[PDB]
Amino acid sequence: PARKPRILNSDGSSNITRLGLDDHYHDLLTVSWPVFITLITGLYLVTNALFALAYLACGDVIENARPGSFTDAFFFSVQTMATIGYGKLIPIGPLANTLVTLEALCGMLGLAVAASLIYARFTRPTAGVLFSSRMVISDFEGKPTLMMRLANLRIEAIIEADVHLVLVRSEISQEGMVFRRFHDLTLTRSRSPIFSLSWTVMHPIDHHSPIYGETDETLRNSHSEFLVLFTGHHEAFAQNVHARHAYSCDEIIWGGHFVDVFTTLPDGRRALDLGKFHEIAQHHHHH
Amino acid sequence: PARKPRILNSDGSSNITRLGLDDHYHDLLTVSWPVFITLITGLYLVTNALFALAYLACGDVIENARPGSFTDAFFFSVQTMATIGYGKLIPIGPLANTLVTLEALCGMLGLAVAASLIYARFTRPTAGVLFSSRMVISDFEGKPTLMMRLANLRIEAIIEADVHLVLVRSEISQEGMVFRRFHDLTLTRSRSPIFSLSWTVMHPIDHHSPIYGETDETLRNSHSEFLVLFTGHHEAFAQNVHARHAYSCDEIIWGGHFVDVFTTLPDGRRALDLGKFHEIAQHHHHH
Amino acid sequence: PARKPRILNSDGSSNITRLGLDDHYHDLLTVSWPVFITLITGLYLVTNALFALAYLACGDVIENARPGSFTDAFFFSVQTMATIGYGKLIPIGPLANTLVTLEALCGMLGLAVAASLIYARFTRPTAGVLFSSRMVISDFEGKPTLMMRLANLRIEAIIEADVHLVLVRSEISQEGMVFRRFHDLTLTRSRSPIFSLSWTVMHPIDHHSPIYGETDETLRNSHSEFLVLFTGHHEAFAQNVHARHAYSCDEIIWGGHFVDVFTTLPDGRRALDLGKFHEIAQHHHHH
Amino acid sequence: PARKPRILNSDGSSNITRLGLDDHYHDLLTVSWPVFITLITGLYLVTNALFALAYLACGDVIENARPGSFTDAFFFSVQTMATIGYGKLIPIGPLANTLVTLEALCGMLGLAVAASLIYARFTRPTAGVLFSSRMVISDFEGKPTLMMRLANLRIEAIIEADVHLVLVRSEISQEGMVFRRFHDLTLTRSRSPIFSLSWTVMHPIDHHSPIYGETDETLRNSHSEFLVLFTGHHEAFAQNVHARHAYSCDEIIWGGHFVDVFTTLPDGRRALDLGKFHEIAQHHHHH
Ligand SMILES: C[N+](C)(C)CCOP(=O)(O)O
Ligand SMILES: C[N+](C)(C)CCOP(=O)(O)O
Ligand SMILES: C[N+](C)(C)CCOP(=O)(O)O
Ligand SMILES: C[N+](C)(C)CCOP(=O)(O)O
Ligand SMILES: [Ba+2]
Ligand SMILES: [K+]
Ligand SMILES: [K+]
Ligand SMILES: [K+]
- The DSSP annotation for A160-218 comes to EEEEEEEEEEEEE-SSSSEEEEEEEEP-S--EEEEESSEEEEEEE--TT-TTSS--HHH
Q: List Cα–Cα distances, D23 to B107, B229, C93, C152, in angstroms.
A: 37, 38, 54, 13
Q: Tell me whether strands A253-254 and A136-139 are parallel, antiparallel or unpaired.
A: parallel
Determine the Cα–Cα distance for residues D152 and A16; give it in Å rounded to an integer. 13
**d(C-alpha B26, C-alpha D124), whole Å:** 25
Please tell me the distance from the alpha carbon of residue B118 to that of residue B114, in angstroms, as a whole number: 6
A122 neighbourhood in chain B, CB within 8 Å: 25, 113, 116-117, 120
3-state secondary structure of D135: coil
Q: How far apart are CA B90 and CA A88, in angstroms?
A: 9
CA C210 – CA C223 distance, rounded (Å): 13
| Distance from C-alpha of B147 to C-alpha of B155, rounded to nearest angstrom | 25
Reported residue count of chain C is 287
Which residues on C lie below 8 Å from B274 (Cβ)? 18-20
User: Which residues are CB-contacts of A54 (< 8 A; sequence separation ≥ 6)?
Assistant: A73, A99
Residue C285, C-beta contacts closer than 8 angstroms, at least 6 positions apart: none
| Best of B81, B83, B88 to mutate (most D CBs within 10 Å, chain D) | B83
Measure CB to CB from residue A83 to each of D48, D83, D260 and give the nearest one.
D83
Separation between Cα atoms, residue D279 and residue A196, nearest integer Å? 48
Closest CA to B7 of B247, B252, B250, B251: B247
Secondary structure class of D43 (helix, strand, coil): helix
Alpha-carbon gap, residue A243 to A66, rounded angstroms: 59
Determine the Cα–Cα distance for residues D3 and D223; give it in Å rounded to an integer: 9
Q: Can you tell me the distance from the alpha carbon of B15 to that of C163, in angstroms, rounded to the nearest whole number?
A: 41
* Distance of residue C85 Cα from the nearest chain D Cα, in angstroms: 6
Strand partners, C90: C63
User: Residue C41's closest chain D neighbor by CA?
Assistant: D105
CB A262 within 8 A of CB A283: no
Are D16 and D9 in contact by the 8 Å Cβ rule? The answer is: no
Q: What share of chain C is helix, strand, coil (3-state, %, to 5)?
A: 25, 30, 40
Distance from CA of D253 to the nearest CA of C (A): 26
Distance CA B99, CA D207 (A): 75
Packing angle of the helix pair C70-81, C93-120 (nearest 10 deg): 60
Question: Most distant CA pair in chain A: distance in Å?
Answer: 98
D283 touches D255 (CB < 8 A): yes
How far lies B282's CA from each of B137, B138, B248, D222, in Å?
11, 10, 19, 65
Phi, psi of D240 (to 5 degrees): -85, 150
Closest to C146 (Cα-Cα) out of C192, C196, C117, C188: C188
Helix (H, G, I), strand (E, B) or coil at B187: coil
B117: left (phi over 0), alpha (psi -120 to 50) or beta: alpha
Q: How far is CA C281 from CA A60, C4, C211, C285, D209, in A?
A: 77, 27, 22, 13, 32
CA B202 – CA B190 distance, rounded (Å): 9
Give every CB contact of residue B190 below 8 A, 6+ residues apart in sequence: B162, B163, B164
What is the separation of C-alpha C246 from the centre of its chain, rounded to a whole number of angstroms?
15
CA distance B58 to B62: 10
Task: Flag if A194 and B244 touch (Cβ within 8 Å).
Answer: yes
Chain D residues closer than 8 Å to B84 by CB: 85
- CB contact (8 A) between residue D18 and residue C260: no
CATH 2.50.20.10, domain A126-287, yes or no: no
Q: C22-125 sits in which CATH class? A: mainly alpha
Query: Which chain D residues are Cβ-neighbours of C119 within 8 angstroms?
Result: 112-113, 115-116, 119
Antiparallel, parallel or unpaired: β C270-272 and C280-281: unpaired
Closest CA to A272 of C137, B20, C143: B20
Question: Beta-carbon neighbour count of residue A160 at 10 Å?
Answer: 19
The gap between the terminal CA atoms of chain B, to the nearest Å, is 23
- Count of CB pairs separated by less than 8 Å, B with C: 141
C-alpha of A62 from chain center:
49
DSSP β-ladder status, B262-264 and B270-272: antiparallel
| DSSP classification of residue A260 | P
Contacts of C13 (CB under 8 A, 6+ apart): C244
Beta bridge partners of B139: B144
Give B133: exposed, middle or buried? Use CB within 10 Å, 0-12, 13-18, 19+: middle
CA nearest neighbour of A167 among A249, A248, A227, A250 = A227
Q: Which of A236, A238, A272 sits opposite B18 (nearest CB)?
A: A272
Q: In chain D, list all ranges with CATH 2.60.40.1400.
A: 126-287
Helical spans, DSSP H, in chain D: 24-30, 33-57, 70-81, 93-120, 216-221
Among protein residues, the one whose CA lies closest to atom 6 of ligand 2: B195
Q: How far is D193 from chain B (nearest CA, A)?
A: 22
Q: Which residues of C225-235 are buried (b: 16+ CB within 10 A; e: fewer)?
A: bbbbbbbbbbb
C-beta neighbour count of D188 within 10 angstroms? 13
Which amino acid would we find at residue C19?
L
Amino acid occupying residue A82: A
Q: How far apart are CA D120 and CA B168, in angstroms?
A: 43
Element (H, E) at A27: helix A24-30
In contact, A104 and A83? CB cutoff 8 Å:
yes
In the chain, the amino acid numbered C272 is L
Interface test with A, best of B88, B99, B108, B165 (most A CBs within 10 A): B108
Residue to mutate (ligand 3; options C132, C150, C187, C192; most atoms within 8 A of CB): C192
**DSSP H or E run through B107:** helix B93-120
Those residues with Cβ within 8 angstroms of residue A123's Cβ, 6 or more apart along the chain or in another chain? A237, A239, B116, B120, D238
Q: Does ligand 1 come within 6 angstroms of the Cβ of A230?
A: no
Cβ contact (<8 Å) for A87 and C86? yes
Pick the residue whose CA is nearest to atom 9 on ligand 4: D195
How does DSSP classify residue C266?
Answer: T
Residue nearest atom 7 of ligand 1, based on CA coordinates: A195
**Cβ B87 vs Cβ D84: under 8 Å:** no
- Give whole-number Cα distances, B125 to A163, B79, C25, C38, in Å: 26, 36, 7, 23
User: Would you say C95 and C81 are in contact if contact means Cβ atoms under 8 Å apart?
Assistant: no
Separation CA A20–CA A10 (nearest Å): 26
What is the 8-class DSSP label of residue B6?
-
Q: How many angstroms does the Cα of residue D110 sit away from the middle of ligand 7?
A: 26
- Tell me the C-alpha to C-alpha distance, in Å, between residue C71 and each of C50, C63, C145, D60: 12, 14, 73, 20
Q: What are phi and psi of A10, to 5 degrees?
A: -45, -35
Q: Which amino acid is at A29?
A: L
Pairwise CA distance, residues D284 & D287, whole Å: 9
Indicate the helix (H) or strand (E) that contains C27.
helix C24-30
Q: Where is chain B broken, named by the residue before each break, C–N > 2.5 Å?
A: 20
Q: What gap in Å lies between CA A84 and CA C214, rounded to an integer? A: 74
Q: What contacts D3, CB < 8 A, 6 or more positions away?
A: none
| C-alpha D202 chain-centroid distance | 25
| Ligand 4: nearest atom to the Cα of D189 | 4
Which among C123, C156, C159 has CB closest to D120? C123
Taking CA atoms, what residue in A is nearest to D275?
A: A19
Angle separating helix axes D70-81 and A93-120, nearest 10 degrees: 20
User: B69: which residues sit within 8 A by CB, 6+ positions away?
Assistant: none
- For chain C, where do the domains classified as CATH 1.10.287.70 start and end? 22-125
Kindly give the interhelix angle for C70-81 and C33-57, rounded to the nearest 10 degrees: 120
| DSSP bridge pairs for D246 | D227
**Contact: B115, C117; criterion CB under 8 Å:** no
| Interatomic CA distance for residues B73 and A234, integer angstroms | 44
- Would you call D100 and C269 a contact, using CB atoms and an 8 Å cutoff? no
* DSSP assigned state of B278: T
Q: Which residues of A touch C85 (CB under 8 A)?
A: 84-85
Per-residue b or e along C237-268, where b marks 16 or more CB atoms closer than 10 Å to that residue's CB: bbbbbbbbbbbbbebbbeebbbeebeeeeeee
**Is A19 in contact with D272 (CB distance < 8 Å)?**
yes
d(CA D174, CA D195): 42
Cα B277 to chain centroid distance, Å, stands at 23
Short-list A156, D13, C242, C204, CA closest to B159: C242
Q: Going by C-beta distance under 8 Å and a sequence separation of 6 or more, which residues neighbour residue A175?
A: none
Cα-to-chain-centroid distance, residue D84: 39
Please give, one letter per residue, the 3-state secondary structure of B26-75: HHHHHCCHHHHHHHHHHHHHHHHHHHHHHHHHCCCCCECCCCCCHHHHHH
Please list, in sequence order, all residues whose beta carbon lies within 8 angstroms of the beta carbon of residue A31, skipping any fewer than 6 positions away.
Answer: A39
Secondary structure E strands in C92-173: 129-131, 136-139, 144-152, 158-172
Whether residues C227 and B37 touch (CB distance < 8 A) is answered with no
Mutate to test the pocket of ligand 3, among D182, D183, D184, D244 (most ligand atoms within 8 A of CB): D182
As a residue count, chain A comes to: 287
Among candidate residues A132, A263, A126, the one with its CA nearest the CA of residue A202: A132
Closest CA to B204 of B262, B143, B150: B143
Distance D120 CA to ligand 5 centre (A): 25
Give the 3-state secondary structure percentages of chain B, helix then strand then coil, rounded to 5.
Answer: 25, 30, 40
What DSSP element (H or E) covers D239?
strand D239-248
- Show the ligand 3 pocket: residues with CB < 6 angstroms: C 189, 192, 194-199; D 182
CA angle D273, D275, D279 (to 5 degrees): 115
Backbone angles phi, psi at B83, to 5 degrees: 50, 50
CA distance D180 to D187: 21
Q: How far is the CA of A100 from the centre of ligand 5 (A)?
A: 14
Residues 6+ apart with CB under 8 A from C131: C148, C149, C150, C228, C230, C243, C245
DSSP string, B250-261: TT-EET-EEPP-
Whole-number Å distance between alpha carbons of C28 and C119: 12
**How many C-beta atoms lie closer than 10 Å to residue C143's C-beta?**
12
Q: Quote the CA–CA distance of A109 and D36 in Å, as a whole number.
A: 12
Interhelix angle B33-57/B93-120, nearest 10 degrees:
170
Q: Name which of D244, B3, D20, A200 is nearest C160 in CA terms.
A: D244
Of C44, C237, C269, the CB nearest to D29: C237
Strand, coil or helix: B217: helix
DSSP string of B133-168? SS-EEEESSSSEEEEEEEEE-SSS-EEEEEEEEEEE
> Given the DSSP bridges, would you call strands D253-254 and D136-139 parallel, antiparallel or unpaired?
parallel
**Chain B residues touching residue A143 (CB < 8 angstroms):** none
Q: Which residues pair with B269 in a beta bridge?
A: none
Nearest Cα residue to C246 out of C131, C149, C125: C131
Is D236's CB within 8 Å of A30's CB?
yes
Among the partner-chain residues C19, C29, C116, the one whose CB lies closest to the CB of B118 is C116
**Residue C231: alpha-carbon gap to chain centroid:** 11
Q: What's the CA angle centered on B66, arms B65 and B72, to 5 degrees? A: 55
If one counts every other C-beta atom within 10 angstroms of the C-beta of residue C172, the result is 10
Structural contact between residues A280 and A136, judged by C-beta atoms closer than 8 angstroms: yes
Taking CA atoms, what residue in D is nearest to A16?
D271
User: Per CB distance under 8 Å, which residues of D are interface residues toward B?
Assistant: 83-87
User: Considering just the CA atoms, what is the radius of gyration of chain D in Å?
Assistant: 30
Q: Which residue, C105, A42, D241, D153, is CA-closest to B114?
A: C105
In angstroms, rounded to a whole number, what is the distance separating the alpha carbons of residues D90 and D74?
Answer: 13
Q: How was this structure determined?
A: X-ray
